Amino acid sequence: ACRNDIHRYDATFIAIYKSLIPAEEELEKQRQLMAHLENLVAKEWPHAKLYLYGSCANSFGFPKSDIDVCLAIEGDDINKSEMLLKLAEILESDNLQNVQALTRARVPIVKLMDPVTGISCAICINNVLAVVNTKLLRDYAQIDVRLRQLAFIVKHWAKSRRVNETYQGTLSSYAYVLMCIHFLQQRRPPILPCLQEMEPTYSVRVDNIRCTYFDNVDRLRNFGSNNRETIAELVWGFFNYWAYAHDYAYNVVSVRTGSILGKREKRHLICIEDPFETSHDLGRVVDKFSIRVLREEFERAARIMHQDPNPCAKLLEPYIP
Numbered sequence: 001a002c003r004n005d006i007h008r009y010d011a012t013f014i015a016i017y018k019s020l021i022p023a024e025e026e027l028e029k030q031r032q033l034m035a036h037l038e039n040l041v042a043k044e045w046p047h048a049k050l051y052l053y054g055s056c057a058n059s060f061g062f063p064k065s066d067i068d069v070c071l072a073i074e075g076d077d078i079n080k081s082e083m084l085l086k087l088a089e090i091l092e093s094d095n096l097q098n099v100q101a102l103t104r105a106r107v108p109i110v111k112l113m114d115p116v117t118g119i120s121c122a123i124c125i126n127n128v129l130a131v132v133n134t135k136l137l138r139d140y141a142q143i144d145v146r147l148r149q150l151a152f153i154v155k156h157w158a159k160s161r162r163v164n165e166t167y168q169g170t171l172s173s174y175a176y177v178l179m180c181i182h183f184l185q186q187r188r189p190p191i192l193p194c195l196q197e198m199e200p201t202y203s204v205r206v207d208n209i210r211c212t213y214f215d216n217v218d219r220l221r222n223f224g225s226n227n228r229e230t231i232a233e234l235v236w237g238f239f240n241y242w243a244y245a246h247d248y249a250y251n252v253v254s255v256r257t258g259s260i261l262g263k264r265e266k267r268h269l270i271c272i273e274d275p276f277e278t279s280h281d282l283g284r285v286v287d288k289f290s291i292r293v294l295r296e297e298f299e300r301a302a303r304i305m306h307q308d309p310n311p312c313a314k315l316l317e318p319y320i321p
Ligand SMILES: O=c1ccn([C@@H]2O[C@H](COP(=O)(O)OP(=O)(O)OP(=O)(O)O)[C@@H](O)[C@H]2O)c(=O)[nH]1
Pocket: 053, 054, 055, 058, 060, 061, 062, 129, 130, 131, 133, 134, 155, 172, 173, 174, 175, 282
């Protein structure tokens, strides 16, 4: 069963959606900065490639002036420290402000702040697998608009309800997009395909991990065109799965497969399998306490999406400790 008036809230959810997406003027400043930093890095390393990654490149990012950049370069004696310090002075002689050398769990990072656009940028060497990660989600976001629409709704819900911190036992935004992709894959008729179970047209390799899938996604623009579910059906339907339908004891959600894999075949309380790094359970951060808070927020989200006379504002009302 579902609401008889569910489509009355399609209007608001998309209005919420297109407000959460970054403005074009903001993204114009990003491409202009990136085109400048690509040409600048290429002057020192003609064989290096700059790739964006993270929220600023998978097309599932909220508005902000911080971008992440992976400097891809090939070789064997690749020392990222000596490169990033040489790169640090090329930024400083380019009149870029606040060129800082930083570390995150010992990975060398350098950060800059562009005076032209006010955008910040964090640069690291050879984080290539994270680049292919965002390429997949960007490729998936091109197939159906409802993926972007649903994922922006859920990500806003996780932040408003204070369940978007892995350091507090909840799930990252990368995990939430995987749950949305997998939810839209299991709807019948399908909204999203399983790119990795298709004829390969893209195949790379990052340290004995071969990422291979079909990435001619503009050939798929009409894939989910036989599924008439609106976003108020999906948003309601998403939280309904994770509150009542997900078999938390035996099930794995698998974008890599587009189906439900068995969990018993091997701390995992909610299993979200990474599409390429398949041993990386994105729910390993959850513990026996935070799983209860997650499922309580799932059950809260479902009843609101099923009963509340104004669910679009009730679903996202902030959580106050
Ligand atoms: O376990 C992970 C998590 C994340 N990532 C990589 O980091 C990216 C997302 O990482 P985040 O979960 O930190 O997204 P975000 O906080 O920056 O987004 P906002 O809610 O702030 O808007 C993803 O694009 C992924 O490639 C991994 O590689 N492994």
